[PDB]
């Protein structure tokens, strides 16, 4: 028992991180097979960033202007292209540490692990969620762009996020590995603001099931509710509307605990309306929404990876 915000083991991704330098700018790249992926903002100076014309900036860049460093070895760039907001730098050496991998575009509400890197070297790993407003609440400094987010299933790494930029309120925005931003954000230094930070209702419910599994039961009340009545109360609290699809996804946790999802919704409703009275649930004083139902099952059943 116990329950922690748990990241995936990062070894498979650590062997893919390199440093990419162009002009006066450095960030991280992802080296898979003979291609290095990195944010296209590596070609910008600080003044470029207010209003960059990336296609025009790229005209003055050749293969040899991209300095790619894996440890103390320089990779040889034999081609480059821009796809949306990422650059793909073809190198003449396949990464011998390339894992089995896929590129996926995740849905809001899904979670992943971030390997925060600087100068191609890892600083740490932590778990994040793609928020409903398409930001993530990460921990990133200057030089962290190009760090990636990922999931693992069995032996296959699904890359879903590459870091680009920081927004007001200290949250972060980036792209999938095809270079398309999550949400409406653009890689330029303009006034951009996250929308409403909506709470991922299905994840809070998953975490309440995790609490029950661990013996933290004080919040189970004597009530049930309906989907429509729950959403009426939760809309006021900026919770995502709960759908039947969400209820079905919670089926495994409901069957394990014997608690119908709508019963748990009634308990959540009272927590939203009356607060937690200074009590804690799984060591937390607020309702945690960055565990998916799959995250809970994984951690409570000991799912491992190869």
């Amino acid at each position: 028992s116990g329950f922690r915000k748990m990241a995936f083991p990062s070894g498979k991704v650590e062997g893919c991180m390199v440093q990419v330098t162009c002009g006066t700018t450095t960030l991280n790249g992802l080296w898979l097979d003979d291609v290095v992926y990195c944010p296209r903002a590596v070609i910008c100076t600080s003044e470029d960033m207010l209003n960059p014309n990336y296609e025009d900036l790229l005209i003055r860049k050749s293969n040899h202007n991209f300095l790619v460093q894996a440890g103390n070895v320089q990779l040889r760039v034999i081609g480059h292209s821009m796809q949306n907001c990422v650059l793909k730098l073809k190198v003449d050496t396949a990464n011998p540490k390339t894992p089995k991998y896929k590129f996926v575009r995740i849905q809001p509400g899904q979670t992943f692990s971030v390997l925060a890197c600087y100068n191609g070297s890892p600083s740490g790993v932590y778990q994040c969620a793609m928020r409903p407003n398409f930001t993530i609440k990460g921990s990133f400094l200057n030089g962290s762009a190009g760090s990636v987010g990922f999931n693992i299933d069995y032996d296959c790494v699904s890359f879903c996020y590459m870091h680009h930029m920081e927004l007001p309120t200290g949250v972060h925005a980036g792209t999938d590995l095809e270079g398309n931003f999550y949400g409406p954000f653009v890689d330029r230094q303009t006034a951009q603001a996250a929308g409403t930070d909506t709470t991922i209702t299905v994840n809070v419910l998953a975490w309440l099931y995790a609490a029950v599994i661990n013996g933290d039961r004080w919040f189970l009340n004597r009530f049930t509710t309906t989907l429509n009545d729950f959403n009426l109360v939760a809309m006021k609290y900026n919770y995502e509307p709960l759908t039947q699809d969400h209820v079905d996804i919670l089926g495994p946790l409901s069957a394990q605990t014997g608690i119908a999802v709508l019963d748990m919704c009634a308990s959540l409703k009272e927590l939203l309306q009356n607060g937690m009275n200074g009590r804690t649930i799984l060591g937390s004083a607020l309702l945690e929404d960055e565990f998916t139902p799959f995250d809970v099952v994984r951690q409570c059943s000991g799912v491992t990876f190869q």
Binding site: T21, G23, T24, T25, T26, L27, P39, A41, V42, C44, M49, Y118, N119, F140, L141, N142, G143, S144, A145, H163, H164, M165, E166, L167, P168, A173, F185, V186, D187, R188, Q189, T190, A191, Q192, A193
Partner: peptide, 11 residues
């Protein structure tokens, strides 16, 4: 706020 692209300066 403006968005800040979190590249780093070349050393």
């Amino acid at each position: 706020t403006s968005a800040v692209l979190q590249s780093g300066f070349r050393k």
